[PDB]
Amino acid sequence: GGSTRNGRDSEAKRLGVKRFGGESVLAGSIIVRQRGTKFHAGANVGCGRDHTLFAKADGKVKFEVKGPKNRKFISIEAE
Amino acid sequence: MTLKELYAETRSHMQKSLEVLEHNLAGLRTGRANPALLLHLKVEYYGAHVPLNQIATVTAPDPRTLVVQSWDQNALKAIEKAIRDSDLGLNPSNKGDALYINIPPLTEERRKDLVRAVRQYAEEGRVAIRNIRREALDKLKKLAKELHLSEDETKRAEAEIQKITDEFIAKADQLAEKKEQEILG
RNA sequence: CUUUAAUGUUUGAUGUUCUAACGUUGACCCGUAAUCCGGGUUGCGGACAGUGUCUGGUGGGUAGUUUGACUGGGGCGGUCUCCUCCUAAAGAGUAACGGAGGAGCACGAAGGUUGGCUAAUCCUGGUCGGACAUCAGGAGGUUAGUGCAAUGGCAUAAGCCAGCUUGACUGCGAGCGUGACGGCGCGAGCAGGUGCGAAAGCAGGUCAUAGUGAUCCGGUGGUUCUGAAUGGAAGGGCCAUCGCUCAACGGAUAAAAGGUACUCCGGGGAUAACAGGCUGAUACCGCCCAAGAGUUCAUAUCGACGGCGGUGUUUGGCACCUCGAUGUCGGCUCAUCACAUCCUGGGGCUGAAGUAGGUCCCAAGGGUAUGGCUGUUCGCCAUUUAAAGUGGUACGCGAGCUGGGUUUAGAACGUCGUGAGACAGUUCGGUCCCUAUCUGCCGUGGGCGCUGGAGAACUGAGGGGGGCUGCUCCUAGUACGAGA
RNA sequence: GUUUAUUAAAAACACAGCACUGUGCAAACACGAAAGUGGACGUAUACGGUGUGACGCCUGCCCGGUGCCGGAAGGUUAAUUGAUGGGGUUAGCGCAAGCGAAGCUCUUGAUCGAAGCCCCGGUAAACGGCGGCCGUAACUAUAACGGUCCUAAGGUAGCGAAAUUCCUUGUCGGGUAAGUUCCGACCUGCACGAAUGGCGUAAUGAUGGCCAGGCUGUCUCCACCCGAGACUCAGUGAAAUUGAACUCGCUGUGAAGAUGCAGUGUACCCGCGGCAAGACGGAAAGACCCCGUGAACCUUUACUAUAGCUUGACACUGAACAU
RNA sequence: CACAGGUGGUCAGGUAGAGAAUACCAAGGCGCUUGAGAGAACUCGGGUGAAGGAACUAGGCAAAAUGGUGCCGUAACUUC
RNA sequence: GGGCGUUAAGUUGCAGGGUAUAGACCCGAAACCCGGUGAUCUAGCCAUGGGCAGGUUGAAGGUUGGGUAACACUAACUGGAGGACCGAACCGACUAAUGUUGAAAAAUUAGCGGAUGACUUGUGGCUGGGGGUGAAAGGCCAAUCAAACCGGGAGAUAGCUGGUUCUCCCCGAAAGCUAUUUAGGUAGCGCCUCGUGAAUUCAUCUCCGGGGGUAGAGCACUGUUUCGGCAACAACCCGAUGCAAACUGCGAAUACCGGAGAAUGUUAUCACGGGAGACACACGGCGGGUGCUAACGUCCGUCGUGAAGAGGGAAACAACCCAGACCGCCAGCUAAGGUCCCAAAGUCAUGGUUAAGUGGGAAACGAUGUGGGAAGGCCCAGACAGCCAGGAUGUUGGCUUAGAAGCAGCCAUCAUUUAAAGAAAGCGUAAUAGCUCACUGGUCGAGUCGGCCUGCGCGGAAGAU
RNA sequence: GCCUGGCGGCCGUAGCGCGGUGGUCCCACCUGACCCCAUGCCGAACUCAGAAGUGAAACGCCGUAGCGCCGAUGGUAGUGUGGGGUCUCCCCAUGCGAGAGUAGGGAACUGCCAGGC
Ligand SMILES: [Mg+2]
Ligand SMILES: [Mg+2]
Ligand SMILES: [Mg+2]
Ligand SMILES: [Mg+2]
Ligand SMILES: [Mg+2]
Ligand SMILES: [Mg+2]
Ligand SMILES: [Mg+2]
Ligand SMILES: [Mg+2]
Ligand SMILES: [Mg+2]
Ligand SMILES: [Mg+2]
Ligand SMILES: [Mg+2]
Ligand SMILES: [Mg+2]
Ligand SMILES: [Mg+2]
Ligand SMILES: [Mg+2]
Ligand SMILES: [Mg+2]
Ligand SMILES: [Mg+2]
Ligand SMILES: [Mg+2]
Ligand SMILES: [Mg+2]
Ligand SMILES: [Mg+2]
Ligand SMILES: [Mg+2]
Ligand SMILES: [Mg+2]
Ligand SMILES: [Mg+2]
Ligand SMILES: [Mg+2]
Ligand SMILES: [Mg+2]
Ligand SMILES: [Mg+2]
Ligand SMILES: [Mg+2]
Ligand SMILES: [Mg+2]
Ligand SMILES: [Mg+2]
Ligand SMILES: [Mg+2]
Ligand SMILES: [Mg+2]
Ligand SMILES: [Mg+2]
Ligand SMILES: [Mg+2]
Ligand SMILES: [Mg+2]
Ligand SMILES: [Mg+2]
Ligand SMILES: [Mg+2]
Ligand SMILES: [Mg+2]
Ligand SMILES: [Mg+2]
Ligand SMILES: [Mg+2]
Ligand SMILES: [Mg+2]
Ligand SMILES: [Mg+2]
Ligand SMILES: [Mg+2]
Ligand SMILES: [Mg+2]
Ligand SMILES: [Mg+2]
Ligand SMILES: [Mg+2]
Ligand SMILES: [Mg+2]
Ligand SMILES: [Mg+2]
Ligand SMILES: [Mg+2]
Ligand SMILES: [Mg+2]
Ligand SMILES: [Mg+2]
Ligand SMILES: [Mg+2]
Ligand SMILES: [Mg+2]
Ligand SMILES: [Mg+2]
Ligand SMILES: [Mg+2]
Ligand SMILES: [Mg+2]
């Protein structure tokens, strides 16, 4: 009849909510299909092809909101 | 072209054929007790045989008489002489806006012809319907193959077809039964 | 030597003639007072036929097998892998034969970088320019655009234009995410070499998420890895790469359709058919509002548009009970209960003169048709009756009867199929078991007990049986009525 | 006449008759690895195979598809022969790079190649097929009749609501008080039709359907009677079944239809003759239905093979000649 | 099974009869290896049934009926 | 740099757990293959013997007469044909009943078909299993046949069914995910058990740090939706009102993730290794898809119970309420639930409701049932009910209609007279008439009316042992 | 401290509209343009050399609340644990407690460097 089918898992979300151990480069947020949902900021950046919030140097996670027009923005200060 | 669109076609065509039978039945001098026979009678007025639909008026005071309530104070004479040129060809009187046309019972000879006829038209209609139903089913098969219907969906559609068919068959029966119950009364 | 010959000679292609292999189921002779067989002679045929090995065709004649799963029983229909949204209860993830769409690619630029740009739409004013081109302004503000679905995203634009380019580079990879696994994804940074830029810096393909096939068996290029005595070589390994709508998309084979009512086995009430059960949408019965018809008049009788229930009772849904068997429909025989009562009984209203009706209330005592057609139930029809009730009882009743319908095996028709066969089509034919232990009924005895033992006659707690009704007459041809 | 010994006797098989087709005799064909044998001590007025099934009048159109028959010019094609090119090795050549003869090898396949298939023609008493939209009419109508589009060609005679018609108890007539059956018609043949024969047909039939006279206990509606059981006594003496029984009704409950649970009603203990409503009574691990990567036999243009039939090459297999 | 089944050939009296049918007998052989009572429902096999006469039933199932010799006489149709 | 390694003791027996090859826990197919035994039954055929009471019909041919040119032809008689007729034996098997643990593993009884023929019968023979024979049913081939019987391969295979035997102690599941010619089977993961390691690992509560777009709400957006406003029928826009799983300019509870802390918890946690079983779940609560917000329905998320848990409660009732059974007791307190009798505990206390057996089944709607409460209108300038009387004129309003005069229907519904008086509320007439009504005046003497907030009852309420 | 420019914090009670306003300091326009460089046409923009002029435009200020925007207290919806009635809905205890709307707020605030008074 047509109605059916559907994508698979495709997790994508926050895997490093707030401050964490934040190793050399965990994930902090793999919510692909975004740029504004989560913006690359601070010691963390990367933002791979699949819009995955990288996360560089070890430390804690912040989860902020700066710059004109909301804009979440994530980063990882020292701990 | 869908199952429903098919059912509709069935109802329509079968309705047409019923109508055919309908006025076909009316096209018979019955006990003429009702205006179902005069309902047509055109009233030639204003250079046009304009039927009583927008010209004169008539009705049956009782089962044994009708009255030509001519709207025009001169049309009263129209329908009068108009009583002819038809299976009527009668000679009513002339009193007031409405004429008068008695309504008695016919002879046994016509009793024969009229009976054999009544039931005749009845069958004629039935047959027409059968053929129609048949076709309805053919189309149904085509749908089955097209709409990729399932044995259950197709058989269901078949049952429905039959339903519509029978209904009309009944209509024909009843109608024939009334025109008859009277013309045979 | 190079074209065309002539003889020669060879060697193939045919085709003729021959005899001498080989055939002879022609004739005769001997073994032999055998039709076998063998030898001999003669005739016919003759390198043919035929046979062996090899080989192309043909080959259900025979043989071995295949002919998927999901599925609100199975089948039919549909589906099977991947991407997007909702379902999904604000982490991840979640099911349905749930609600809606897409993919099996496309790009040498539609990739990289540097530099620059920013819409849709409306208003107004402008040659041909009008709904809608191009132009000027103003308003407007991601409503545009995005190679293709949907979601998220995008102005520092990923959206648009151009210059120059090849980072759609090679080797690696801290650390993560996501999978049962195979595996898939993100990835800063390092080494070598690129490109673009003045430079910081950016680039390991495209805004991202679909655009896909494991293994095996092999093909190709490279390599001094290995190479069966040694040197090579074949082959093998390693690196790069090619070949599968294996799409039933974790891919059983390189190679696979059906029939069975001629059937068979191992299992299931995990799973259909019958009947029970849950449910009551549907069905049937009832009530609510009251526009209308009823001349007048909603509610005597009926009732539009819509509304609320009751029963278990139709059509259905579910698959809980039986598949180590609960015999189907109708008839017969015998029933028993309900009341939504067909007749008879008692009433209210009446569009109830009477006689007859209509509708509602009460009432289950009793009663409630014979035939023609068909297997029917039912139904139509004939003719009766006071009436020919509706329903529950495994659609009551086969360890009680029938076996006409209906599912075995025979056969034929129409129809479908190449065909075996097939049909919720038809047609002619076609085995119906049980000695009753228990309950329960119908009868009938034997014990004991009723407080001394007997023969009788009762009382009557209770229980059962029966409960139908026509017609005629008298009242009275009166009441009533215009009469009839 | 024959048939499912043991639920089918028939409309089924057979039949005489008809037709097609194969077979020249060491026949075709069949049993058989073969020898041999049947066919037949027969020989085309014979024998085998196939279909139709006395007889009467008959047996239409289609050869596109499959099969069979003939052609076989051309295209494609087996084994066979093996051209030709390539490679491995190595004598020699060379300080080396590489090049490399001959031989041996591995590979490559020119070329030669029959039937078959394609192709050309035929063939239906061979397997088979015999029209769709719908074309133009007394109110509408309706579209049997038949235009047009396409077929290999579009059902001729005869028959038709039939052993074939779904709607269906079609419609009409007959028979009956009343007839879904029956008989005679109509034709709208879902979906007859000419040897998987069409329509008829005297006679025949334990054949299907319908009707009538006779006849009756078939029935209304059962009554009496004669015998064999049943019942009683004496002798002999089974069966299936069976977890255990101190084996009641109802209403509800409950794995959803209760002798056994709850409530309640009832009921002194035990036989004998009868009856079958229940013990989802007894009997057979349901035969229907589904399932198992179960079985069997059967079918076919499923797959893979194979006997048989058939092709060519080499061998047994030789001598000449013409081209 | 001391089983109402199956089993080939031969013989062939009397009366009646077409007859190896049939009924009664001859020669001959038997009463069938549980008996005795009773005189129930019901089952089995029979006999007779008022009036009706297929109303039965899926269906005249089963019953009842017909039944010989001679003579008279006999339709459609017909392959005579 | 990264992978795999590197200061892990191995090894050989003995006992046990598991696995592999074997029949591999035991019993069981339908079947497949190999070699033999069977034509004393039956099916065909071959050879040689036997049988068919009686009764009927009467073909061909022939003779004679007629007839013909001769033939045809004809008629008597003679003759004796036939898958010919009736009917015993003999063969067969259409119907019914009875038998059905039979007299009998197909018969008995009464009928029935053939009975000189494709007939029937005795003896012996010949065809053998994928084979035979078959007037064809898959029929028959020794009570066996869609492939005989016997022995063997053989303990075929059986992801299926059943069955699995002594005692005590401890722990204790799953009925899911993902693959699967897979779906009632398996395998990895998950959950159980056992061993060995290791940390304040893990849990609860508190506090701290997080992302969230669900509930809800809202309507800028995407759609949908009305009502008004500026459109030779209407969108756009504006204001007012709603709706949304695939709407969001807002937004919880809360779950989840991380950090710190105390207490408690026989380590509850993680890792590795020996043994598993289990991948049919069911009901109830909550959030949902689907279904009819039907089902003891179905598909998910999550929690609880049954499964795998007895005891008490709900009459009886796996799942619901309470509550987790080591054992013994003729001892106490309680939970859920109860305290008139069956039946343990109050005919308990105070105050109020109900009067229907409501309690002890059921809706829209209907009603002066009844308890309570806030309030409003009329009222001795007489309310309220009853009683007397009144209720007119233009006008029969206009139209319409046969007629429509208050009263079929449409429009209008004013004015005059007044204490009051509708161009009229119902009945009624053909239309008028006539009757009653609104209303008003008097009589009457003290209350009256219906709305609302709330408690309990009544009708609506028909089924089968 | 007044004014201005550059760079940021924070991002609507920081914005929009409307009115007023500032100048040869700074900025803005502005002049000139062969050239540096630039126009898929234009010195418009970028780019360069710089008067004359003016704050007109823009920009920056100031005022103004019409349109945004922020926004309670209270009540309402929902909801976690416990309990209760119940036709799919709701009630009670107790924690958490919106959205909208109302009151009201509101014409940003702020740091570093530089240049003018
Ligand atoms: Mg086969
Ligand atoms: Mg095999
Ligand atoms: Mg399946
Ligand atoms: Mg989620
Ligand atoms: Mg313009
Ligand atoms: Mg893309
Ligand atoms: Mg798969
Ligand atoms: Mg058969
Ligand atoms: Mg079975
Ligand atoms: Mg079940
Ligand atoms: Mg059922
Ligand atoms: Mg049951
Ligand atoms: Mg009643
Ligand atoms: Mg009847
Ligand atoms: Mg029944
Ligand atoms: Mg019986
Ligand atoms: Mg039958
Ligand atoms: Mg058959
Ligand atoms: Mg016969
Ligand atoms: Mg038989
Ligand atoms: Mg028989
Ligand atoms: Mg035939
Ligand atoms: Mg023909
Ligand atoms: Mg009759
Ligand atoms: Mg007929
Ligand atoms: Mg035919
Ligand atoms: Mg025939
Ligand atoms: Mg006895
Ligand atoms: Mg005895
Ligand atoms: Mg019960
Ligand atoms: Mg009995
Ligand atoms: Mg039983
Ligand atoms: Mg079974
Ligand atoms: Mg004896
Ligand atoms: Mg009698
Ligand atoms: Mg009868
Ligand atoms: Mg009868
Ligand atoms: Mg009889
Ligand atoms: Mg008799
Ligand atoms: Mg004979
Ligand atoms: Mg005879
Ligand atoms: Mg013999
Ligand atoms: Mg046998
Ligand atoms: Mg073996
Ligand atoms: Mg075995
Ligand atoms: Mg697979
Ligand atoms: Mg909501
Ligand atoms: Mg959640
Ligand atoms: Mg499973
Ligand atoms: Mg499961
Ligand atoms: Mg579940
Ligand atoms: Mg359930
Ligand atoms: Mg279990
Ligand atoms: Mg009650």
Swiss-Prot record, chain A:
<dbReference type="GO" id="GO:1902626">
    <property type="term" value="P:assembly of large subunit precursor of preribosome"/>
</dbReference>
<dbReference type="GO" id="GO:0090070">
    <property type="term" value="P:positive regulation of ribosome biogenesis"/>
</dbReference>
<dbReference type="GO" id="GO:0001558">
    <property type="term" value="P:regulation of cell growth"/>
</dbReference>
<keyword id="KW-0820">tRNA-binding</keyword>
<comment type="similarity">
    <text>Belongs to the bacterial ribosomal protein bL27 family.</text>
</comment>
<keyword id="KW-0694">RNA-binding</keyword>
<feature type="region of interest" description="Disordered">
    <location>
        <begin position="1"/>
        <end position="14"/>
    </location>
</feature>
<dbReference type="InterPro" id="IPR001684">
    <property type="entry name" value="Ribosomal_bL27"/>
</dbReference>
<keyword id="KW-0689">Ribosomal protein</keyword>
<dbReference type="GO" id="GO:0000049">
    <property type="term" value="F:tRNA binding"/>
</dbReference>
<dbReference type="GO" id="GO:0042256">
    <property type="term" value="P:cytosolic ribosome assembly"/>
</dbReference>
<dbReference type="GO" id="GO:0003735">
    <property type="term" value="F:structural constituent of ribosome"/>
</dbReference>
<protein>
    <recommendedName>
        <fullName>Large ribosomal subunit protein bL27</fullName>
    </recommendedName>
</protein>
<dbReference type="InterPro" id="IPR018261">
    <property type="entry name" value="Ribosomal_bL27_CS"/>
</dbReference>
<dbReference type="GO" id="GO:0000027">
    <property type="term" value="P:ribosomal large subunit assembly"/>
</dbReference>
<dbReference type="GO" id="GO:0002181">
    <property type="term" value="P:cytoplasmic translation"/>
</dbReference>
<dbReference type="GO" id="GO:0043022">
    <property type="term" value="F:ribosome binding"/>
</dbReference>
<keyword id="KW-0699">rRNA-binding</keyword>
<dbReference type="GO" id="GO:0022625">
    <property type="term" value="C:cytosolic large ribosomal subunit"/>
</dbReference>
<dbReference type="GO" id="GO:0019843">
    <property type="term" value="F:rRNA binding"/>
</dbReference>
<keyword id="KW-0687">Ribonucleoprotein</keyword>
<comment type="subunit">
    <text>Part of the 50S ribosomal subunit. Cross-links to the 23S rRNA. Cross-links to the A and P site tRNAs.</text>
</comment>
Swiss-Prot record, chain B:
<keyword id="KW-0648">Protein biosynthesis</keyword>
<dbReference type="InterPro" id="IPR023584">
    <property type="entry name" value="Ribosome_recyc_fac_dom"/>
</dbReference>
<dbReference type="GO" id="GO:0005737">
    <property type="term" value="C:cytoplasm"/>
</dbReference>
<comment type="function">
    <text>Responsible for the release of ribosomes from messenger RNA at the termination of protein biosynthesis. May increase the efficiency of translation by recycling ribosomes from one round of translation to another.</text>
</comment>
<comment type="similarity">
    <text>Belongs to the RRF family.</text>
</comment>
<dbReference type="InterPro" id="IPR036191">
    <property type="entry name" value="RRF_sf"/>
</dbReference>
<dbReference type="GO" id="GO:0006415">
    <property type="term" value="P:translational termination"/>
</dbReference>
<protein>
    <recommendedName>
        <fullName>Ribosome-recycling factor</fullName>
    </recommendedName>
</protein>
<keyword id="KW-0963">Cytoplasm</keyword>
<dbReference type="InterPro" id="IPR002661">
    <property type="entry name" value="Ribosome_recyc_fac"/>
</dbReference>
<dbReference type="Pfam" id="PF01765">
    <property type="entry name" value="RRF"/>
</dbReference>
<dbReference type="GO" id="GO:0043023">
    <property type="term" value="F:ribosomal large subunit binding"/>
</dbReference>
